[PDB]
Design a protein around this ligand. Structure first.
Ligand code: A1BNZ
Ligand code: ZN
Length: 139
């Protein structure tokens, strides 16, 4: 679990969005596994606006942060799960690292701010949904 809180927005994995997220829906994209909802309180997270390919992510299944080198956001095949049929997930970045069910929502950060959230894993890999292209989160 986990979310990004920036301005009057909450960014979560679309497959973990709650009834309240859908009632206050701003934007969602099944191909990216992202959903953004509106909030009443101000969020203070800073979104990175950069092309960093190194950062640190939080892994809830280890209660630890790990440094990672990750690929540029791209279209990657993701196997069928109870949440989605087999498909290409867009804007996904892969890295070598531990990730298991329950880790989605952990933040990946670089020196500039929040880069994205855990969205996929297994086999010693971890996949992050990028949020750096969503410039409207800042306004
Ligand atoms: N973005 C997606 O489509 C996710 C949705 C949840 C599932 N998902 C994952 O990759 C799971 C692994 C998994 C489990 C059962 C399956 F039938 C297929 C794959 C996972 C997420 C996070 C960290 C480690 C593993 C894709
Ligand atoms: Zn950066």
């Amino acid at each position: 679990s986990g979310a990004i809180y920036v301005g009057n927005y909450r960014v979560v994995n679309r497959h973990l969005a709650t009834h309240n997220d859908w009632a206050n829906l701003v934007w969602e994209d099944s191909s990216r596994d992202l959903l953004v909802s509106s909030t009443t309180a101000q969020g203070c997270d800073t979104i990175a606006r950069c092309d960093c390919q190194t950062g640190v992510y939080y892994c809830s299944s280890r209660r630890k942060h790990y440094p990672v080198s990750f690929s540029k956001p791209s279209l990657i095949f993701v196997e069928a799960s109870e949440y989605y049929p087999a498909r290409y997930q867009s804007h996904l970045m892969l890295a070598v690292g531990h990730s298991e069910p329950g880790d989605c929502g952990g933040i990946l950060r670089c020196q500039h701010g929040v880069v994205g959230i855990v969205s996929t894993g297994g086999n010693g890999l971890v996949g992050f949904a990028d949020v750096r292209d969503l410039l409207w989160l800042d306004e």
